[PDB]
Design a protein around this ligand. Sequence first.
Ligand SMILES: [Mg+2]
Ligand SMILES: [Mg+2]
Length: 756
Amino acid sequence: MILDTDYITEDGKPVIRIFKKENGEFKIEYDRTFEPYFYALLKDDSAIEEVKKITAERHGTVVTVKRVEKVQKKFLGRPVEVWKLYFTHPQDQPAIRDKIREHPAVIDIYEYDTPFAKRYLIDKGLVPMEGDEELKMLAFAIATLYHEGEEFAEGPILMISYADEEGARVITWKNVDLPYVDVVSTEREMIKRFLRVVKEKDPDVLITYNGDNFDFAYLKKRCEKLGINFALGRDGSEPKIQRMGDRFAVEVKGRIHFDLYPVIRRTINLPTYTLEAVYEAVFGQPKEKVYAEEITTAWETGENLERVARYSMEDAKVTYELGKEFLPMEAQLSRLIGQSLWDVSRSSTGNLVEWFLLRKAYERNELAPNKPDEKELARRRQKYEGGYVKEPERGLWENIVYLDFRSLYPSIIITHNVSPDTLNREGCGEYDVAPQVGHRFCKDLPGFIPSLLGDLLEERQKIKKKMKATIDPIERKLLDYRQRLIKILANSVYGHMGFENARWYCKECAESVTAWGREYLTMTIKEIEEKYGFKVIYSDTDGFFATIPGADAETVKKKAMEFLKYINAKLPGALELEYEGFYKRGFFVTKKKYAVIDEEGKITTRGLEIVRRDWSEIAKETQARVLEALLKDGDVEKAVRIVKEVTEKLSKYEVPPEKLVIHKQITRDLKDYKATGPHVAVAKRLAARGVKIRPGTVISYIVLKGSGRIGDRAIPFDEFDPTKHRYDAEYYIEKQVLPAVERILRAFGYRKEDLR
DNA sequence: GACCACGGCCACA
DNA sequence: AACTGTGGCCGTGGTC
Ligand SMILES: [Mg+2]
Ligand SMILES: [Mg+2]
């Protein structure tokens, strides 16, 4: 199994290293034959002898063009005559590439910014994280003595905790009577203990939580102070820091540094993303938090150090459990993209797509288009139309069905050969025209993108058959992971075509897919209403809720499957409407805001305040109890009782302040904000106090009793004292609880005045 | 000063 | 999952 690849420099020549895991042993493969290269397009092939001799400087060393080679490749379906430029070292490219482009005899250069180690995986056709081998893992966390106002890593690291299959342990340099604590003389010997432990276990994966921005940075500062060779790498190297935009990421050569924070933040939606909140949301168990003000006091006074050691032990223990949950999914995603788990776990969906396309474009001799320049990106700022959004028939409905399409946009791309290499191609025989936009796509040859989506969805169906026959839950869970990720990948390729900074950007291909989706959707809602007498209540892009007015439950499920047979014979090719599920009742408030309940009792809410993080828990809890009384029993009397009970408890200040916290995220620097809302007002006051507010910080404020602007009365929930503070019960009643529940109860004539 | 567009956030698919 | 795109909603300051 391939873990990752990089390259070292031996006598000036590049040597690819392939970190592998075979037969339960860590191996390293060396390759001294791979040569860096990028392509160039010239006005006249005679200029190759002039373009052979451009030189540039690098580290005071003149860079040369090693050799040239003529090749025929496919640039958007069309064969082109492109020249291949070879170089001695990868870093020779960024020094000479701009001078080659500025040569008058050239038109453009292609595939010049591709990293060497990633280029090796693509050209050699190697796929990481492939195989049956099991990886040995180890999570770790640290604890530091924190004082305000001091520099970063000014205080020493007090405890280092690690956890794996054998359990969790804590290394510390003060005596603590606990069975999992290993005591040490000093901090330096505490650190040196951790290196020896990591070296002995020899883990393939090191699991952290926000270790890209803190743990490795803190250990790096201390190791330089105490003169420690932090040789965590399998080759004796030290942790390497890479820049990830406004942040950093840490590498450990030979191993995989799996930071859970970027993986968890994108795979889950929570109000706060503290390690305690993530653990309780995933495993349903409370994890106790001990703040740095408690760590420092307990350490400097030497009192109650077991309570802090238990927090350190649990940190690494829950980090290991979260690691075993999110890594198999991300490992299969790495096998699909064809890149290392380190890069995949920290990359945007767009970059993952361009990695998949670049690997696929290499297998088909397809020259990759370059990233758009500044001026081209300006011409790509035109907005196109999305999917059909029907204004829902407001109110409560009974006995309904939802019928969706099986992968709407990938099916449209496959069926109609939607691709930038097929758009308006002169001289074909079979054309397909898109509605409204009128774009034509040749079909004599399968397009580049429809071939990939066709190959992907074919594999996905093959995986599902292999999945249901698999007996061991392990591969069944992994096959389920792969067949899942394939669906998201195929749908993500469509969005790539509409992205301004995409290599395979095609606005015409994008809007044509949405135009076809609107046609096929509006036709089925028209067929199901005129032929079978259904009533489409709500529709969004690729599905709709419908029923026959005043019909019986089995009669709905009967004629619904009749309509499915009729519409699937009329749908062309890969397009397919399917039966998703039946639900007894369902309330529809507005666009992208509804809630249904099946015959089993499970309620699925969409878009309502229940699923939003910027709403108080008291308002989300009340709206849920109201929906449970209606969707399950239809007892509107129980719902109006619930609301009046909550408001009275709020009016008497008897509701816990924890349920009244509002969580809003900061997205930019506080100077960029042109409108200062409540969560920005409290953040600016905080920054004046000294605390750093970073883009992405989650603010948790509470509104206090008073008058005027809300921002002038909102304090962070850190500073709320029940003996000293009283929240604005008037605000939470009339601006949170009542507005949220009244949108539903207004369907029964109940006004907010009747809800108090 | 009631009325309103509007940043700003997050959600649906 | 969500770069593509479509919407609901609120606290806030601008308006005449
Ligand atoms: Mg290129
Ligand atoms: Mg890398």
